[PDB]
Symmetry: D2
Subunit: 469 residues, 4 copies
């Protein structure tokens, strides 16, 4: 009975003109409007400017659009496993502007919310603040364009970046269910950027896996109120591409690092755990320590990999791996997820590092002119203000220390690491300098001196304990 | 998993003298009344409370007024609250008004690690410049005034800087919660409970129904459990319904009948109480509008039928309401992101004064009728077409249409059309131009009945909606 | 060694229609009248001019109104300029007011590569909120209003953002210049010529005296030649003296002056507004030695000169010829308002149209009726300094000048420390009036009836008056 | 006649209590109140915080206070030839905060002027904006403290740093002449920071080489108006230490200097830094008349003076004694950096440790080994003036100096236009290099292996030299 916003897929997309700015939902392939992307490929519109968490993958969602070089510029938090995207960045076909994930989500929200700008501690003192990130090459490996700096201001004695609202000509979203007046319901972690994206475009287009009538969706269950949606399309049903089909049915220093990291958890903690050693450590949490895992793409209550029967493209973790959920879990959008993180609602954040400094700076982020992926949610995670523990092997395989006085590699966050756990040692960062807290059963203080690239205090060292099985 | 469930007394025993509280609710809807009663019993004093309003007499935050436990209220609207209004005027309580959209988003920003953000809301008003009376001494004289807000230009337009709100406690009421704190709300009782939920160091949630972890669908959780520290399951009670609305005035009918012709098909509209709301009842033959209510609903309907009355389903004026097919519920941060982002096609409100400049005064007259800005400051300043509906002259013979406002401005350069029982005006180039007239008074007699001059060359006759 | 010397005509010929100018001068003093004359001759139109004032009728900038060569004025003061005020009222001219101290510092900031800076001046006035009428239509209807200034807090108090001023030309006048453009000024005719000289793309100076390079002591140079593009030597002419003041009934005025005179203490540096505050400097008691600051760039200002020591280059803030005393010092207008905005005055005494229990003051303009401008008063009242208002207690007609809240546009918000009248001396304490003294053997009861607000009156003494 | 502020040296200084913030005039030893620093040593005040352009020199001025550990913290632009200073920072007894010279001076003025903050392009994108310069060590050479970041904002599409006003308990100043009022007159380049230092202190103490009576300083010749000065001291006569008594009496760098000499052109105002840029001044051909600027407050700087005209008050930026030419002009350091920051130089020619194809420049820090501070280099590079770098093609270690991206901490970002070496001349175009000229018949493949990057050579000529 109500408003009817339904259109065919070609008709909904036909007025996107050359040069249009798009905001696109999706986290990797989860909630990525591939059907609509396939249709905009068909119409052949050129030099698009696209704001999205990533650029999908080779042959999927936004990834489709690189094939006939339809993309001028991507503004993105991560490139991920997208070879055509990286190749077109490196070969000078595409401008690539990085934005930390949480800032990208809040900027889109802001543009929908009539907020022209807001402050965040994210990216402060990084190259995303100072400018000079390589955004465009020429045709012959030469730097053609560089990122513009961010402005900064102090509040309460801490420094923050000014972020500007993002407003687009079009927004493209995917949802599990929509009604005819454009109310959208999402499923699992495929929600993600689809809420902030739907709010920031002048013309918003939603593909729905299920169209229902007005009044079929409980108003209390609506995730994106129909006011935001202009056009709804019902593509023929298709299987969302699963990047990492992870299911439940060497050099194991990693297990030792994970077993010590496991002693960091306390009962009742909410935790965000990075790919690798941090996640592994969750397997060694003792009985009587109940912690809830958060996934930055919009879950708390994250469980281990699903059993075969539970494998679901809508339920993946930050590394695009298929995931389960536990009793009392809860889904939220990407803006809420980074509000959660930025607002320091995690009790523990556990991350890897390529290099970590005595002052508590750390570098993963990138290596310039080299293997360059993007900030992802790493910059928001570390600037949370919350307890950050780094779990990493003590040295590079060639001997070079990963624990330094100050970072040579570009900084992910400034003065944010509290504790460094390696196979040899546990260091606290106390007043911008290092204190050796623990050493492994029969190493010595003397060898850890030699394996770390800075001095430290060692006036009260204990043996490093490990959690069992 | 987690069990955060707790007695009423234990949940609240840690609240000390001087504590700051952010408290959910819109009027009585979603107001954690039971927790407020407990706070009264424990007898803490010098509370500083942030909330949309302060409940009503005998209900919610209202009950804490009667033994003078409240030092300062930061509020959008006083509402139907006599003890609150009384204590402000007599100097027992300090009152800072915050526009409702700004209050909700400052709480969210508090929860989200965003120390400040810009909004066009309240620019050029007393809420930006300072000089609203926030405290009186005990003989009518001014003790304290509101501090100015900073301003900054973006794209040639001026915005107010709003600061994050963080409280010692936040207090929240939900329809359902599980043991680990996940909340689901019902109807428009959601409102501020989500942003309030996010901004407190210690967050306490009163639930109407407790369920076990895993009874709530993860996709139906409105406040994730990470935000809640303490859940309490009070003795079940009914939410107080302020106005149980169920299915010589002619001046308000004709203005509402002319104002219904402003509705075009497919519009999303926010109506004020009084004349703008009654304009909906004359929505013409083939015009589909969707009504927004600032407390967190699109698809608002007429008053419910007697047996379908529901205390969680109320409009801005605190009346029981229904929902139409395709309705959607959302929290107050989202409500004002919708409004401040220009997602309404029309907002229609009333006035104490409206200028030829486009200025509108409609939120207080100093020392006499002080209600607060409500959502009105947001509604006027978001670039949405604003049509004011009001009787041509006030309850003297003085024109409610003046050259420049003398009462405190709700917003500047914002009214697009003005509709009265005798005339209709448009604001062009910061000045008044007569586009319609009916009841059939000529230009000269209305021209004397208004407080300003005006252009009047393409004047047609004013129609009415049947 | 450079030679920037040119004819008057060739120097000015490059000013195209719509050019923006910054122009030196305070009133007539240091106003480049010979160049302004030339700009009239060549007939350029739609000028945008920044200057302290706009000259006077028939002199300096005022000359340019005769042929409607001015589109927009940005000034602090209209002054004795009837064409100006009139052309504003009847829609020929756009007029934007800027506090004098802000105007000087914005010019310098424009010269100094500072895009913006913060000042307390004008905070909470019409000049920061927007809504001063900058342009009328031809029927006295409002066409344009001033745009708001941004504001930020520092150290718990609010400040206005001011933007740099950079103009197509700057026009300055000096007593002396060499061929490479070093300028030396005389008396208070320096004023805006320094910052004006810094902010122009093409800066032209008229000099009363041209000398060779090496003839000016490098230590006596006021505007370094690097700043000056073109130097002009007009045929010599007498600077217009507005008020040739010399040494040789309603006398409420003299009782107020005599009470205000008791506000002075030994060692004070003081700025006194025109009227009663200046008259009070006549009744300064015997052991009290003060230095008077004149906002156009003088400390050590003395009384009017003798008949044959009159000097057009030495005038006070009200454009009157004046002397200087032993140990006096001249400075330019940026410096002058750095002095003031910096709190270096010990007392500032001002008149009022209206003064509030609040401590607000209104004394600079009344929309559509008095076109004056803020002058230096906004700067004077909003720096750290003690402000005393000397005013008649009531209007002529009997309405109070001491009100609860200002109805006229406020010069400063919460700034007045003491109010002295013929009846009374009120202090402003915690945002309300406390009566401290009353006159004569008048009564608390008559002053209650004469004041537009209530007040505290629990330690009222009798009002003393200097000898 | 007037006020009297004269005091003895001991009494003027005795109420400086421990933990006191001082602002001190002087540039090297020029205009530095040495006698007062001496007396302050006598009194034994502890834990001082000092804002000054430098910290004098061993045994001279602020340097006299490092001997008995009297200084907690220095806020400085340049440490410059001060071994006790550099040593106490390194081992960890003195906290050292670097501030760009122009920013330092304007912050002090701002403190004097009631301007809480202002913006400037100086230091944007450097370690002085981002934080992470070492400001205090411990005993074992680890970082106890880092500088806190500067905040930043866009105006007109360009990023500026926010600078905070400096106000101190005391300001110590030296002047050539003062009266009893406190009106000061400075001499030569000994003015420098003394004007803005004199404005920004609660209590300001001035040592005068010459005391005169009120009325003996022409009011038009006063450089610091007496309002700013609280106490005037007249030490026993003493000679200002000359660091470099350079005088005019009766080969790799010569080639660069002769090419650099061609950059000059008639009418230019030019700032030359120490080394090859100052050398290039010697070879200006023809009737090419330039005017040389010294950042310490001179335009019209000439060669090293003849023996009998050396004067401690007339020094360049490298603290060398200097002559001045016809048309010269002196001004204080706030004005100097307004002149520089406001783009009033046509050419600034500088040295480099590294220059990038980017156009970035590193010339002020090399971590651990040379940590003397930004001086005025950051102000000179970010003011939009045409900047030209003169440098040897390689290090003392044989490494290349034209690199891709600076390894060393940057003085300025995308600032350099032309790079001049003995081997070649590059232009920075579109954010990368482009070789335009070579000399000695060495060719486009000989320089490529000697420069640290590739570059463009689409239209190359050979390098002309001044005779
Ligand atoms: Ca739309
Ligand atoms: Ca909590
Ligand atoms: Ca010029
Ligand atoms: Ca002083």
């Amino acid at each position: 009975i109500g408003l009817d916003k339904v259109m065919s897929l070609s008709s909904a997309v036909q007025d996107i003109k050359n040069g249009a700015t798009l905001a696109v939902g999706g986290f990797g392939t989860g909630g990525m409007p591939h059907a609509i992307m396939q249709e905009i490929k068909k119409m052949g519109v050129r030099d698009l400017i696209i704001y999205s968490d990533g650029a999908g993958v080779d042959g999927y969602g936004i990834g489709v659009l690189f094939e006939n070089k339809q993309i001028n510029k991507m503004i993105v938090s991560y490139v991920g496993n997208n070879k055509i995207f990286a190749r077109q960045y490196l070969e000078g076909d595409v401008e690539l502007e990085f934005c930390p994930q949480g800032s990208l989500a809040e900027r889109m929200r802001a543009g929908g919310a009539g907020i022209p700008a807001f402050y965040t501690p994210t990216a402060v003192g990084t190259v995303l603040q100072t400018g000079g990130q390589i955004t465009k090459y020429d045709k012959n490996g030469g730097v053609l364009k560089e990122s513009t700096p961010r402005e900064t201001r102090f509040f309460g004695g801490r420094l923050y970046c000014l972020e500007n609202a993002i407003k687009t000509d079009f927004s493209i979203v995917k949802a599990w269910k929509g009604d005819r007046c454009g109310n959208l319901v999402f499923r699992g972690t495929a929600r993600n950027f689809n809420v902030p994206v739907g709010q920031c475009g002048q013309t918003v287009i939603a593909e729905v896996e299920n169209l229902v009538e007005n009044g079929d969706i409980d108003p209390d269950e609506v995730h994106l109120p129909g006011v935001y949606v202009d056009r709804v399309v019902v593509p023929e049903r298709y299987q969302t591409l699963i990047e990492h089909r992870t299911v439940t049915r060497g050099e194991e220093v990693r297990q030792r690092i994970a077993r010590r990291a496991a002693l960091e958890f306390a009962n009742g903690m909410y935790v965000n755990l990075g790919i690798g050693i941090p996640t592994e450590s969750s397997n060694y949490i003792p009985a009587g320590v109940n912690v809830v895992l958060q996934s930055e793409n919009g879950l708390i209550g994250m469980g281990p990999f699903p059993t075969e029967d539970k494998v679901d493209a809508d339920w993946i973790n930050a590394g695009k791996q298929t995931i389960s959920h536990l009793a009392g879990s809860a889904l939220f959008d990407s803006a809420t997820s980074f509000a959660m993180i930025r607002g320091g609602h995690m009790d523990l954040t556990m991350l890897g590092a390529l290099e970590v400094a005595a002052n508590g700076d750390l570098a993963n982020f990138m290596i310039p002119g080299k293997l360059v992926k993007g900030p992802g949610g790493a910059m928001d995670l570390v600037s949370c203000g919350t307890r950050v523990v780094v779990t990493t092997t003590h040295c590079n395989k060639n001997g070079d220390p990963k624990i330094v006085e100050r970072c040579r590699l570009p900084v992910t966050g400034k003065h944010c690491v509290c504790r460094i756990i390696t196979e040899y040692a546990v260091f606290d960062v106390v007043d911008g300098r290092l204190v050796l807290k623990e050493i492994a059963e029969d190493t010595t203080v003397d060898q850890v001196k030699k394996l770390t690239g800075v001095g430290f205090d060692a006036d009260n060292v204990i043996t490093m304990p490990l959690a069992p099985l």
